[PDB]
Design an enzyme around this catalytic site. Structure first.
Site, short mmCIF file in Angstrom:
data_model
loop_
_atom_site.label_atom_id
_atom_site.label_comp_id
_atom_site.label_asym_id
_atom_site.label_seq_id
_atom_site.Cartn_x
_atom_site.Cartn_y
_atom_site.Cartn_z
N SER A 140 0.81 -1.20 0.00
CA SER A 140 0.00 0.00 0.00
C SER A 140 0.86 1.27 0.00
O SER A 140 1.70 1.46 0.88
CB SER A 140 -0.91 -0.01 1.22
N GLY A 141 0.65 2.11 -1.01
CA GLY A 141 1.40 3.35 -1.12
C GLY A 141 2.55 3.36 -2.12
O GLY A 141 3.02 4.42 -2.54
N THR A 145 -1.13 2.75 -8.53
CA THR A 145 -2.08 3.59 -9.27
C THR A 145 -1.45 4.69 -10.09
O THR A 145 -1.79 4.84 -11.27
CB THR A 145 -3.11 4.24 -8.35
N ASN A 185 -1.89 5.44 2.89
CA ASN A 185 -1.99 6.24 1.69
C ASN A 185 -3.14 7.23 1.75
O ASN A 185 -4.22 6.90 2.22
CB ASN A 185 -2.16 5.33 0.50
N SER A 188 -5.76 6.28 -1.25
CA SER A 188 -5.75 4.83 -1.35
C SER A 188 -6.97 4.19 -1.99
O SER A 188 -8.12 4.47 -1.62
CB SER A 188 -5.53 4.21 0.03
N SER A 189 -6.70 3.35 -2.97
CA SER A 189 -7.71 2.59 -3.68
C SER A 189 -8.18 1.56 -2.69
O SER A 189 -7.40 0.75 -2.19
CB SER A 189 -7.09 1.89 -4.89
N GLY A 391 -3.14 -2.81 -2.58
CA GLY A 391 -1.85 -3.25 -2.08
C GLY A 391 -1.85 -3.77 -0.68
O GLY A 391 -2.62 -3.35 0.17
N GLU A 393 -1.50 -4.47 2.95
CA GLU A 393 -1.53 -3.55 4.05
C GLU A 393 -1.66 -4.27 5.37
O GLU A 393 -2.27 -5.33 5.47
CB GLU A 393 -2.68 -2.56 3.89
N1 LIG Z 1 5.76 8.60 -10.10
C1 LIG Z 1 5.08 9.29 -9.18
N2 LIG Z 1 4.98 10.64 -9.31
C2 LIG Z 1 4.29 11.35 -8.36
N3 LIG Z 1 3.68 10.91 -7.29
C3 LIG Z 1 3.72 9.56 -7.21
C4 LIG Z 1 4.44 8.72 -8.05
N4 LIG Z 1 4.35 7.41 -7.61
C5 LIG Z 1 3.55 7.49 -6.53
N5 LIG Z 1 3.25 8.76 -6.17
C6 LIG Z 1 2.86 9.27 -4.85
O1 LIG Z 1 2.53 8.21 -4.03
C7 LIG Z 1 1.13 8.31 -3.63
C8 LIG Z 1 0.42 6.96 -3.68
O2 LIG Z 1 0.87 6.07 -4.71
P1 LIG Z 1 -0.30 5.13 -5.24
O3 LIG Z 1 -0.29 5.13 -6.75
O4 LIG Z 1 -1.59 5.71 -4.74
O5 LIG Z 1 -0.12 3.65 -4.68
P2 LIG Z 1 -1.06 2.35 -4.62
O6 LIG Z 1 -1.96 2.26 -5.82
O7 LIG Z 1 -0.13 1.17 -4.60
O8 LIG Z 1 -1.89 2.45 -3.37
C9 LIG Z 1 0.48 9.41 -4.43
O9 LIG Z 1 -0.59 10.01 -3.66
C10 LIG Z 1 1.70 10.26 -4.87
O10 LIG Z 1 1.95 11.42 -4.05
F1 ALF Z 2 -3.19 1.08 -1.10
AL1 ALF Z 2 -3.26 0.98 -2.86
F2 ALF Z 2 -3.27 0.91 -4.68
F3 ALF Z 2 -2.18 -0.46 -2.77
F4 ALF Z 2 -4.28 2.46 -2.92
MG LIG Z 3 -3.99 2.46 -5.87
#
Ligand SMILES: Nc1ncnc2c1ncn2[C@@H]1O[C@H](COP(=O)(O)OP(=O)(O)O)[C@@H](O)[C@H]1O
Ligand code: ALF
Ligand SMILES: [Mg+2]
Length: 673
Positions: A140-141, A145, A185, A188-189, A391, A393
């Site tokens: 997660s984080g 996404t 996050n 967070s999705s 992700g 968590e």
């Molecule tokens: N390449 C990137 N450029 C800018 N911000 C990013 C990048 N990768 C991740 N982030 C940062 O990380 C945060 C969360 O990543 P995220 O895509 O939401 O992860 P996940 O889908 O695994 O939960 C965003 O809110 C952002 O600030």
């Molecule tokens: F916590 Al995620 F994509 F893994 F929002």
């Molecule tokens: Mg996500």
């Protein structure tokens, strides 16, 4: 000079059991031999492809990543797959100009970029007429996404112009109803999602269908500290026009009890802004003003449900105001509702409260499923799946939701392992290559079976389905059934599963109810025939079971596509930019099999092209290689290779194709130009 372990940083440079002297501290230390790992020449500063590394060890990978990172480079190819470390900051690398710079570029012709992954997946699709899939992995984080979003951004800008325009609205809309701020996050999705983009034989985008998994309905009615519910709630409440404010009979952030931690501001986001942003996207997506107000109306009703209050004595709601508003917003009869809730069979506060919550969550889950459905109608030869699951968590309190989420993460990591290590070698032998199997020691089957084992040895999910009998009773049996199981650990109805990503100690509280998802058919019917059409629309075996199905259907689809893993690494746990936690990174690199994934790409033959293709693509490099006339693919290749003076270690001639070592065809390509 060498790599010796360290606390501050996974590893430290030290010059030579062995007794070395750290270059930082200077402090001379004496450590085992097995603790030392060889450094690489300076020529390898920030290699784009770590398969290239002369020395491949945790210490060298971590180093190569750390360097590129602080150098602003977050993408690094590692063998076949790719690794990305969350910058947690904006980087000037996702322009449209750059999308151009990467158009039709070969992996080796451009620095590592998620665009390259997108593009090479694209071409490969047309090239081999095989469905592709880009799978983002990460706790997660990590960044699943942001990166999934970049892949779609790229694809929409190269193969498309409405569709594309709307395609780019899908997430902005979905995120608004399914994302929420968690301690891990902020955006967070709270639901997994497989976006499948359809193209014609020409390569142009044609359709697009989004499938979502495990939406955390629970969040609709409660959130832990510093956590907030689905963005849309905060959006509407904070940005609704005064006429909508009282049209929806909306309240304030502290007038709603489903809004646990009242109004929890997000970092760089403005609810009022995001609201117009959402309405803008819904607009673009094609939602009618009434579709939008009807959606926002349902959101409001979900909040008002939370305000209903029952009292003890059975239970009786002295104040029906909320019950009134809710019905007003649902096209239901206050007295028919109050009756169905308070007595469908006498109900106590405890059970009256439950029913209302159950409805809330159910109402939201459907509003989501609907919005998704509607989005799919508007969005709808070859398809390119993109998978952004929820992700892994480990929250302070991990419920049934987390089990499913983490289970899916375990399932995905396994898919990686299988593909990377099993399928790889399988194809070797299958094509007749001189190859001796390598057990890379990476199998999650155990844990996975400990959860989804339907028949035979009962597993967590099935034990539950059986259970539904206290929730605690469930835990007791789960133990007697699993208990010992390697990836199990007895612990309050709590137990522990040793997931690849870590040890999660779950809390079976309410699991039985959660797996059953019991609604109040009474009120349920009332809505079924609501004076309001949208409501009625919304309301026109066990959860665990249902998921298993959906998951398997996915895994299968994925099984029938060329996967492209993008491994997202989270740098630190402080949502901090520029702070690379050497050990948090090392651990992630560990359970993701990144090193083993690079070893096999080295010890084996990653690239592999069919005779003819090799012949046509590089005959120019050895024009006088093949006989003038008919020359069989195989003998022709064999000739050319000889003509190229290719070191026999660099390849293998299989039944239908030649297998090449990492970066061999690359050089062949470079020479070709
Ligand atoms: N390449 C990137 N450029 C800018 N911000 C990013 C990048 N990768 C991740 N982030 C940062 O990380 C945060 C969360 O990543 P995220 O895509 O939401 O992860 P996940 O889908 O695994 O939960 C965003 O809110 C952002 O600030
Ligand atoms: F916590 Al995620 F994509 F893994 F929002
Ligand atoms: Mg996500």
């Amino acid at each position: 000079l060498v790599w010796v372990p360290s606390e501050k940083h996974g590893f430290e440079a030290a010059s030579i059991e062995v007794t070395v002297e750290l270059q930082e501290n200077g402090k001379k230390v004496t450590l085992s031999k097995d603790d030392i790992q060889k450094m690489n020449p300076p020529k390898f500063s920030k290699v784009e492809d770590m398969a290239e590394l002369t020395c491949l060890n945790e210490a060298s990978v971590l180093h190569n990543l750390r360097e590129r990172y602080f150098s602003g480079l977050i993408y690094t190819y590692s063998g076949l797959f790719c690794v990305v470390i969350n910058p947690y900051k904006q980087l000037p690398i996702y322009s449209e100009k750059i999308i151009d710079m990467y158009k039709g570029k070969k992996r080796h012709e451009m620095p590592p970029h998620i665009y390259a992954i997108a593009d090479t997946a694209y071409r490969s699709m047309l090239q081999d007429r095989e469905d592709q899939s880009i799978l983002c992995t990460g706790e997660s984080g990590a960044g699943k996404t942001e990166n999934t979003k970049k892949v779609i951004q790229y694809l929409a800008v190269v193969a498309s112009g409405e569709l594309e325009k709307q395609l780019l609205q899908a997430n902005p809309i979905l995120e608004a109803f399914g994302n929420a701020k968690t301690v891990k996050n902020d955006n967070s999705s709270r639901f997994g999602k497989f976006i499948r983009i359809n193209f014609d034989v020409t390569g142009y985008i044609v359709g697009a269908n989004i499938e979502t998994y495990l939406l955390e309905k629970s969040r609709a009615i409660r959130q832990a500290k510093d956590e907030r519910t689905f963005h849309i709630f905060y959006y509407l409440i904070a940005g609704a026009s005064e006429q909508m404010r009282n049209d929806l009979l909306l309240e304030g952030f502290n007038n709603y009890t489903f809004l646990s931690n009242g109004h929890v501001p997000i970092p760089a986001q403005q609810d009022d802004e995001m609201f117009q942003e959402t309405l803008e996207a819904m607009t673009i997506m094609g939602f009618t003003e009434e579709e939008q107000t009807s959606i926002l109306r349902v959101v409001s009703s979900v909040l008002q449900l939370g305000n209903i209050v029952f009292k003890k004595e059975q239970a009786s709601m002295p104040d029906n105001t909320a019950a009134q508003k809710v019905c007003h917003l649902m096209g239901i009869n206050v007295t028919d509702f109050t009756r169905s809730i308070l007595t469908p069979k006498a109900q106590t506060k405890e059970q009256a409260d439950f029913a209302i919550e159950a409805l809330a969550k159910a109402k939201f889950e459907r509003l989501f499923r609907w919005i998704l459905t509607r989005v799919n109608k508007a969005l709808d030869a070859s398809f390119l799946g993109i998978l952004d699951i929820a992700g892994f968590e480990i929250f302070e309190i991990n419920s049934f939701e987390q089990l499913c989420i983490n289970y899916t993460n375990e399932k995905l990591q396994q898919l990686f392992n299988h593909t990377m290590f099993i399928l790889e070698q399988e194809e070797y032998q299958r094509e007749g290559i001189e190859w001796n199997f390598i057990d890379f020691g990476l199998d999650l089957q155990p844990c996975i079976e400990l959860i989804e084992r339907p028949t035979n040895p009962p597993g967590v999910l099935a034990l539950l389905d059986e259970e539904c009998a206290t929730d605690t009773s469930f835990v007791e049996k789960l133990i007697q059934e699993q208990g010992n199981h390697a990836k199990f650990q007895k612990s309050k109805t709590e137990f522990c599963i040793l997931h690849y990503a870590g040890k999660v100690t779950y809390n079976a509280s309410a699991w039985l109810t959660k797996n059953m998802d019991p609604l109040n058919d009474n009120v349920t019917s009332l809505l079924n025939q609501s004076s309001d059409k949208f409501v009625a629309d919304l309301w026109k075996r066990t959860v665990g079971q249902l998921y298993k199905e959906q998951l398997t259907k996915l895994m299968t689809t994925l099984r029938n596509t060329n996967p492209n893993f993008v491994r997202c690494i989270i740098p630190n746990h402080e949502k901090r930019a520029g702070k690379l936690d050497a050990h948090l990174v090392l651990e992630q690199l560990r359970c993701n099999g990144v090193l083993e994934g690079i070893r096999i790409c080295r010890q084996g033959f990653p690239n592999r092209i069919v005779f003819q293709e090799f012949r046509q693509r590089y005959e120019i490099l050895a024009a006088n290689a093949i006989p003038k006339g008919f020359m069989d693919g195989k003998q022709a290749c064999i000739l050319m290779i000889k003509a190229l003076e290719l070191d026999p270690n660099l390849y293998r001639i299989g039944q239908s194709k030649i297998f090449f070592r990492t970066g061999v065809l690359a050089h062949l390509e470079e020479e070709r130009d």
